[PDB]
Amino acid sequence: ADLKLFLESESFNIDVKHKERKENKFVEQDDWF
Amino acid sequence: ADLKLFLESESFNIDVKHKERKENKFVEQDDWF
């Protein structure tokens, strides 16, 4: 939403950002990782 | 084998027992436990 406001409003991310918050095995799985 | 020797020899379990030794996924195992 910050991003909507950000891209769709110029005032920077910041004031937008206030505004928004109103303010197998276990081994086989480990393996691929 | 101890038992074979035990039942089939009187000298007790002991000397028989010398004589014999010549002397999956992580959830799944945890769930079974």
Method of determination used here? cryo-EM
Chain B residues 3-32 with CB within 8 Å of chain A: 24-26, 29
Kindly list the distances between the CA atom of residue A28 and the CA atoms of A13, A32, B27, B29, B30, in Å, as whole numbers in the listed order.
Answer: 43, 7, 13, 14, 16
Please count the residue pairs, one from chain A and one from chain B, whose beta carbons lie less than 8 angstroms apart.
Answer: 12
Resolution for this model in angstroms, one decimal place? 11.4
CA–CA separation, B2 and A25 (whole Å):
38
Q: How far is B26 from chain A (nearest CA, A)?
A: 4
- Residue A24 host element (H or E): none
| Contact between chains at B24 and A26 (C-beta distance less than 8 A) | yes
Contact (Cβ atoms closer than 8 angstroms) between residue B20 and residue B3: no
Q: Note the helical H segments in chain B.
A: 2-7, 13-20, 26-32
CA–CA separation, B5 and B7 (whole Å):
6
